[PDB]
């Protein structure tokens, strides 16, 4: 337990996520107190929602912590798919919070501004700190998307609060809600697509275009007859696993062919390669 | 579309499963409209429960029809991971609904809505009847959804005999806890498959396979053994063998393939490296 925290502070993304966790629960206590201070009209709901947000941040932090673990017999590849799974569940949570924004808009449908300013300062701190989001490339992408969704949703609710006061429109809140949900869903689509591609054992998109030339280079090797059962997939970000079977001549140089195939697929970016070499009868 | 309708009305097992769906979605609509009508949060939570159970079934059919597709260059293994992903996604969605209705239940327990509209206040024993007949007549989730309807059973009795407003939130949190408990095992299996974990049905026989491969003549060591689950009962295994400078690579390859095929591995890649000395 004591050494768990030192591993957390050693890792940059983990320490930033713990910064966010501590800040989120501190402001949660503050706003819960302000909530039970005789103002529980809609803020109790807001309190519970940013508890959900803190849960998502905790999911990202836990994903990083498990990702830096050591492999064993049960988890021979490690726990490096935890970042991909976190990105996936964070994208799905963003879809669900888009649905919740839609429900909030439908709460009005056809028929004081102080928790939101601290939410705004929290979320601009998030934009500043997590600018490099764009195990970092998968966890920080989902965390950046979640923080952006909360950021721009709070922006939308403040836009509603400022339109009903300055010019007195009663329709802008549902329309800003549908704009809000549509924009965050459109933003979260690419991360879900990449996560689904990784978890479906799809060929890595960066590796996909360079693979036919790699197969041509392997087929050009002296004494190789055919390539079979070539499978490439993404383990984690920028780690590709590849397998293929080679039918070679009955007297082919298996050492040289193995070394050349490994070289060819190493220049392409395949970290883990398994080449089975089968000697032909004829 | 004409051929589809006649076929599904003549078979038997498909007829029972489509009865399962159509009745379940129908009463999901009815009890959702009753819940949004009055203040039955617990009832709309139960509606979300068996709504997502019906989506689990129909997403199972959709994932089956997707995994029937032929593999291409991009998807080398095919679309067989679609069933695992669909189960995982629906489990996550059930978790999310459980958490949100937990939140709304605590909010309702803070201040009770005091609506208690009756009308056909007996929608709840209709829900009990329908999920009983669904789970028995048709085909831990085999009995978890039975406990979901009993939550609104006592809420309606408490919502009539004394009108105690604390009951409906308590049923909402109880339903949420039941949902997460029911969903946990499927999520565990899906997480294990998607994390490239060694298949549990293969883990106990793997040390014996390693000892058998090591006993092969000319084999020096086993390195970088990786086994994972592609889909149900389809295991992919990779390993690298360091062998003698003059070992029988053909025989060693055949014996390693036999050893791991007897253990249940369907896709095996054995890389053989000849030692310098």
């Amino acid at each position, epitope marked *: 337990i004591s050494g768990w925290f030192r591993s957390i502070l050693s890792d940059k993304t983990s320490r930033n996520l713990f910064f966010f966790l501590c800040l989120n629960l501190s402001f949660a206590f503050v706003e819960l107190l302000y909530g039970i201070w005789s103002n529980c009209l809609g803020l109790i709901s807001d309190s519970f929602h940013m508890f959900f947000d803190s849960t998502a941040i905790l999911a990202g932090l836990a994903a990083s912590v498990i990702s830096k673990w050591r492999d064993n017999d049960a988890f021979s590849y490690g726990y490096v798919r935890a970042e991909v799974l976190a990105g996936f569940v964070n994208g799905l949570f963003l879809i669900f919070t888009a649905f919740f924004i839609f429900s909030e808009g439908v709460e009005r449908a056809l028929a004081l501004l102080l928790v939101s300013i601290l939410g705004f300062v929290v979320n601009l701190i998030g934009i500043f700190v997590f600018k490099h989001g764009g195990p970092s490339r998968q966890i920080l992408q989902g965390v950046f998307l979640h923080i952006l969704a909360d950021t721009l949703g709070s922006i939308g609710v403040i836009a509603s609060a400022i339109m009903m006061q300055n010019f007195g429109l009663m329709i802008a809140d549902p329309i800003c809600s549908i704009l809000i949900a549509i924009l965050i869903v459109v933003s979260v689509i690419p991360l879900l697509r990449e996560s689904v591609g990784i978890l479906m054992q799809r060929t890595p998109p960066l590796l996909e275009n360079s693979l036919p030339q790699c197969y041509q280079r392997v087929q050009q090797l*002296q*004494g190789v*007859y055919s390539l079979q059962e070539q499978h490439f997939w993404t383990l984690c970000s920028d780690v590709y696993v590849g397998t293929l079977k080679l039918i070679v*001549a*009955p*007297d*082919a*140089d*298996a*050492r*040289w062919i*193995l*070394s*050349q195939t*490994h*070289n060819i697929f190493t220049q392409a970016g395949v970290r883990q390669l398994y080449v089975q070499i089968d000697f*032909a009868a*004829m | 579309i004409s051929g589809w309708f006649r076929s599904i009305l003549s078979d038997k097992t498909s007829r029972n499963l489509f009865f399962f769906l159509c009745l379940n979605l129908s009463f999901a609509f009815v009890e959702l409209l009753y819940g949004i009508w009055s203040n039955c949060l617990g009832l709309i939570s139960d509606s979300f429960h068996m709504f997502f159970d019906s989506t689990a079934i129909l997403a199972g059919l959709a994932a089956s029809v997707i995994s029937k597709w032929r593999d291409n260059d991009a998807f080398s293994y095919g679309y067989v991971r679609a069933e695992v992903l669909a189960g995982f996604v629906n489990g996550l969605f059930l978790i999310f609904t459980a958490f949100f209705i937990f939140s709304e239940g605590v909010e309702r327990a803070l201040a009770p809505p005091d609506v208690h509209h009756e009308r056909l206040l007996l929608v709840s024993i209709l829900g009990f009847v329908v999920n009983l007949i669904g789970i028995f007549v048709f085909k831990l989730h085999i009995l978890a959804d039975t406990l979901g309807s009993i939550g609104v059973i006592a809420s309606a009795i408490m919502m009539q005999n004394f009108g105690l407003m604390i009951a409906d939130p308590i049923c909402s949190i109880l339903i949420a806890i039941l949902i997460v408990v029911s969903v946990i095992p499927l999520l565990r299996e899906s997480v294990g498959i998607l994390m490239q974990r060694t298949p549990p049905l293969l883990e106990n026989s793997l040390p014996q396979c390693y000892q058998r491969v090591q006993q092969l003549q000319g084999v020096y060591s086993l390195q970088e053994q990786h086994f994972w689950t592609l889909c149900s009962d389809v295991y992919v295994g990779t390993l690298k063998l360091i062998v003698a400078p003059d070992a029988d690579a053909r025989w060693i390859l055949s014996q390693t393939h036999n050893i791991f095929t007897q253990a249940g591995v369907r896709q095996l890649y054995v890389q053989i*490296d000849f030692a*310098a000395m």
Partner: antibody
Amino acid sequence: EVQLQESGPGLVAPSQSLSITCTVSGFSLTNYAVHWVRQSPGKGLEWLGVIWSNGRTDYNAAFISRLSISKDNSKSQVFFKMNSLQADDTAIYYCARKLAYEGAMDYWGQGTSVTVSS
Amino acid sequence: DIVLTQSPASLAVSLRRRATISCRASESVDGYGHSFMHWYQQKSGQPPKLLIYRASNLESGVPARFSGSGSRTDFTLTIDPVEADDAATYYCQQSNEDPYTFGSGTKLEIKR
């Protein structure tokens, strides 16, 4: 008993074709690759090509447009056809059995001297 | 391609002594622990005879006085002791890269 015999024309007119037959004994062409190497006083030992057990041919990129190697497993013969013979092609042409599972060549024929002149 | 440079072009060594022939490769002929370099011996009016394959493995039936060593780009053929029948030309051949290329050749001259 592993023995390779090359039989070809000693004299070849310039810009004509050179055809050498390598007859093997003591091993089968069904599981052995045969290389072709020429040795000249100027350019030394030059590797030309190899025919594999299934008929796959790999050639030197300098001769790819004018070289062709074929074989027939029934009579255990390998056929070496070269076109556009020029004055720099005077060399002793060997057919060599590839050392099994290695990139070397363990058995060589005696070699046929080929003189390209008018 | 890979250019193999043999030094010296000619070597004079007396009886019962050690002779050293070096082959230098333009690019590395190593792959995953194996050095795809082969040594041949060609006597007068004879086809080349393989001595060492993969830079340290004696061909079956060659005398134990022939030795090979080296890796990456630098390789050494060592004859110890040097006999009278070792009067021949020694070639290094690489097989790491297509096309196969041979060394320039080193003539071992027997001093008497």
